[PDB]
Amino acid sequence: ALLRQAYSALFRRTSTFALTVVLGAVLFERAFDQGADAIFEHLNEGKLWKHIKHKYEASEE
Amino acid sequence: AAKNVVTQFISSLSASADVLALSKIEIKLSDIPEGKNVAFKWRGKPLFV
Amino acid sequence: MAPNIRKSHPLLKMINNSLIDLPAPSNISAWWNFGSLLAVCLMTQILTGLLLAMHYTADTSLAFSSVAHTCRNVQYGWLIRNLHANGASFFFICIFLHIGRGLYYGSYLYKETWNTGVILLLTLMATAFVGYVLPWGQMSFWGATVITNLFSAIPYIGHTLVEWAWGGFSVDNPTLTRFFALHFLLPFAIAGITIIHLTFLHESGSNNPLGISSDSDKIPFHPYYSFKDILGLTLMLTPFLTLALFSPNLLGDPENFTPANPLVTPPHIKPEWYFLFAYAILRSIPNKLGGVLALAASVLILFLIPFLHKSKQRTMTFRPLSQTLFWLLVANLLILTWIGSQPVEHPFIIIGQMASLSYFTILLILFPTIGTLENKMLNY
Amino acid sequence: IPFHPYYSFKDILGLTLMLTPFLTLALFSPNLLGDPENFTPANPLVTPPHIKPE
Amino acid sequence: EEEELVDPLTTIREHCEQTEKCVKARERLELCDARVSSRSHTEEQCTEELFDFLHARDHCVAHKLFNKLK
Amino acid sequence: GELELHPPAFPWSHGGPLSALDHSSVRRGFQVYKQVCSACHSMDYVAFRNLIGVTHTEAEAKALAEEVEVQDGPDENGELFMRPGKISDYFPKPYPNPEAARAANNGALPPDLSYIVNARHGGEDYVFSLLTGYCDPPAGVVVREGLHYNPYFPGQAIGMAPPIYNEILEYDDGTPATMSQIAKDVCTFLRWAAEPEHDQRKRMGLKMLLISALLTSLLYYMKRHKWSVLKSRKMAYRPPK
Amino acid sequence: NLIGVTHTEAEAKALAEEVEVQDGPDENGELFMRPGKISDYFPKPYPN
Amino acid sequence: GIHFGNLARVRHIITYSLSPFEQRAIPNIFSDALPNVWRRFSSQVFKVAPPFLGAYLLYSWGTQEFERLKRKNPADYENDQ
Amino acid sequence: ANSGDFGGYYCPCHGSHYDASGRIRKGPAPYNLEVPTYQFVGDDLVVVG
Amino acid sequence: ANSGDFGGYYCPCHGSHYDASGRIRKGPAPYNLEVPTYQFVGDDLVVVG
């Protein structure tokens, strides 16, 4: 039972609660960032400079 | 959310995008006679030769 | 002595005695969340404001380009500029509902809390106005010209009063620098008075929807209303950001993208949305002084509300006639705003004078009348 | 004792005293108390030799 | 390969000018032009009609012109 | 008298709340401005560095700026002097001051295009319709000499003769330079120019919706959670007898 | 500034008209010389 | 200062309440919540809506009527030559 | 210039109508446009001020 | 330039003494003056930067 496992280990002690929020926020960030950027770039295929880029970037001369 | 909004506002103080990163400066060693020091405006702060 | 260090400490006893152990009616509706939002705006405006002030340059030959630079060069400057400009709008939206609530629920019976409120409104208006002049665009200029020109309607000391205002004999640099000074300053005076507003309040306590004493049922501000306000915050914040991020200029006039021209008044010169309704009234009275007086009164009339209360009950919750009149009044302002955004031509001109005449009657004559009437229908 | 009128009057007086040399100074000898290097527009290349703070 | 540079805009203006609304508008315009042109002392002008046409034409045009552009 | 034709609404690739600008179309837009409009229209708030990473490579940008002569100085004898452009320079003003700009356009003042799409109702939809909308004046309308008829311009008499015509230039990327193809591109540029953030501003707007969604929810629960105590509450009046 | 301190208004004005002052731009955005006005600042003997 | 203890005089009222952890946050969403959302909507929509719907018309009218006055009336140039 | 219902002038701010003489004919404006102090000292060269 | 007790440099702010090499010899200064990246691409013409 995670709810109990979590409560007992993370949420009970107001000090471990904080460590969870920090440790969590860190993970949440790194992932939420990729995901969104990934969703955004996909929604705009071939329009961003990230895409066009290869045509002039060390390709000529 | 918080960390991110601070991230932004705090770098609103950093150097802007208009702040350059310029080149060099040529100087004739014939204007600076022996036994002397001279100051040239360069990359913001003085430059001695 | 005092056991906890929350009730004794000369300071925490304040954070605690005015927002944590504060007695709040258990039944205040969402219409009471505007107080905090107004408060939050103030802090957000002030913050984003400073950030901008650190890149602005109060000088005609440099104002417009400084703001432009602030956006295109300053890291996240563009975002800060947006937030500051759109906060100005959400600030007004919030203040208008804050007022309506007061009106509809007879909170104005709290005279001092109310009068300081009106003072707040006027101050916020003056502030938002001069802010709008700093970027020195076309509206910026012509706005500065018309509003300072208003004193010209005051006989004698008039034409002089305009001279200070400008610092010269026609809008120019001095006007722009004493405006930046003024803008920089007022917000604080706002924050200051806000403290008093809230202090007078505290003498009596909050009002509540049914308008009957809630002493039989109070609750600690925290966690009841602190949580409710956090939520009320994340709600206003969503469209504020949806707006500022997805459609930046939706709410703002575009004339301000054209550097001020002392020789050309744009043909489609309107004020920022939140002033239209007054602009509408000003354009009603076809006489210099009358229009000015009508304009002044269009806001100053708020000071009279407390005195035009005849109902034997406090709110309109149980007054169906006042309600209709109340909502008829709202639609009434909603119209003036539309009118303010249209040219001075028929059918507008006529519709205009009407809505104005309508505005002042619903407030000075109707309300107090229907109020008395209602008392008789209850057999009082 | 009640601050007023004891100390209010004592402070009005304590004011007119500080005020006299403050004005005698600012009106008769303006720059007495101040460094003169600040009469020379900043030069990013030259640090004045006699650089002292206020 | 063998081609020819045609402006997709002109093509689509042709097809749209065949639209129900454009024809019925293009018609009213041709009529005005005729009377204002013939009359040698009339203050009348065919701006209004011109607009109705253009409004209709151009509206239609915008609905597809961009599919053919790059 | 006060009659006007309003532009329609084209479906720009960057119209969506989540749609970025087509950086390919902007690179072209730039070319159009650089080789056609920059002849009379200034763009004071954009600079060669701004193109970097958006539409051009650092090499390109730098060379693009070295193609211009820039006044600098003073030198050692307090003499102004020409020099090649640096990526830090702003796009070149085609006239020293408005007075002269009018002087070579029949007293007409070609506005700086930096913030144009936001200084005119209709934005790119307007600018476009105006570029492609030139035509003959209707019956009864006489256009003053030196002026041109455009129904889209307020007054219908505009001081700018149609700037673009088929093949007037050649996109070095191989795109058929028809007239609307150009207009369409240059307008896409005038947007990027009036607000470079555009793309990032929308990527943020995305992140904002998700977090906003997630968060409003979490807090709505927490608010209900606490309040339950009062929501379920039951009271009874049991006076003594 | 010389007026009422060391010179008469006449004097000051003529004193300033003894100088050539660059103004502009004109109609063709061209700079152009002109006689000085009492509102001009003392002439700089070097451009920079 | 302190207002908890002075407020008012109350007698003979019992109130029972349950911790938040013993009950549901948003209970009876269907049987209770929505029914009242509707209950409320109904009672109020006729005091509010009317005047808005009213101003709406006045808006649509004055708008369309300002447009009509832009168009020309043939009867002005049907005599011209 | 050239607008308003009096073939003169129109103030877009609050709707004042002036005629080709600069006189106030309709709207909230109080007086007629000010007429400066000028003179005709040429064939086709006038001097205001 | 040309002052201090090491015939080099002297910072009038807090009394630092640098030699003709720009090295810190006396005073509160922590390191020697920075030496830029240059090149003598001439007979009497040098290029810094």
Ligand code: HEC
């Ligand atoms: C010969 C100089 C010249 C060229 C080349 C030119 N324009 Fe213009 N443009 C003008 C003039 C003159 C005006 C002013 C018209 C007026 O106000 O009478 C103008 C005005 C404009 C306006 C709208 C002004 C308004 O008041 O609405 C836009 C938009 C514009 N030009 C865009 C362009 C674009 C895009 C191009 C390049 C594809 C271009 N111009 C090239 C001369 C030019």
Ligand code: HEM
């Ligand atoms: C800087 C502007 C303002 C801020 C930040 C502000 C803040 C507050 C706050 C936080 C509250 C308490 C919570 C609430 O009931 O909303 C409050 C209450 C109140 N405010 Fe304001 N206020 C402002 C403007 C005004 C204005 C313009 C008026 C008057 C037209 C006004 C009238 C009132 C009244 C009457 C109360 C008591 C409300 C009640 O009956 O419960 N306030 N205000």
Ligand code: HEM
């Ligand atoms: C009462 C809260 C405030 C309100 C209502 C407010 C409102 C405004 C408004 C309406 C503008 C014009 C925005 C635009 O459309 O460009 C503005 C701009 C500005 N404000 Fe404020 N402001 C507030 C507080 C502050 C404060 C205290 C500062 C700085 C400490 C500040 C500094 C500025 C500056 C520099 C600008 C001009 C540049 C720009 O527009 O970005 N503001 N303000």
Ligand SMILES: CC(/C=C/[C@@]1(C)[C@H](C)CCC(=O)[C@@H]1C)=C\Cc1c(O)c(Cl)c(C)c(C=O)c1O
């Ligand atoms: C300004 C504010 C609350 C602000 C914050 C900042 C708290 C101090 C902490 C958590 C938050 O984020 C709130 C928004 C409340 C204003 C405020 C008051 O002053 C008073 Cl007397 C009352 C009766 C209410 C009732 O709702 C109120 O909202």
Ligand SMILES: CC(/C=C/[C@@]1(C)[C@H](C)CCC(=O)[C@@H]1C)=C\Cc1c(O)c(Cl)c(C)c(C=O)c1O
């Ligand atoms: C809405 C208003 C004035 C409002 C004030 C003057 C209140 C009457 C008192 C408190 C204030 O400070 C407001 C700014 C004037 C109308 C008004 C404007 O606002 C603006 Cl921006 C402009 C450009 C015009 C042009 O004609 C105008 O008529």
Ligand SMILES: CCCCCCCCO[C@@H]1O[C@H](CO)[C@@H](O)[C@H](O)[C@H]1O
């Ligand atoms: C309450 C709503 C909070 C929304 C927080 C979203 C944080 C914005 O996130 C921003 O995204 C940009 C592009 O992905 C990055 O370049 C910025 O560095 C980053 O701060």
Ligand code: FES
């Ligand atoms: S800065 Fe040189 S001695 Fe301190």
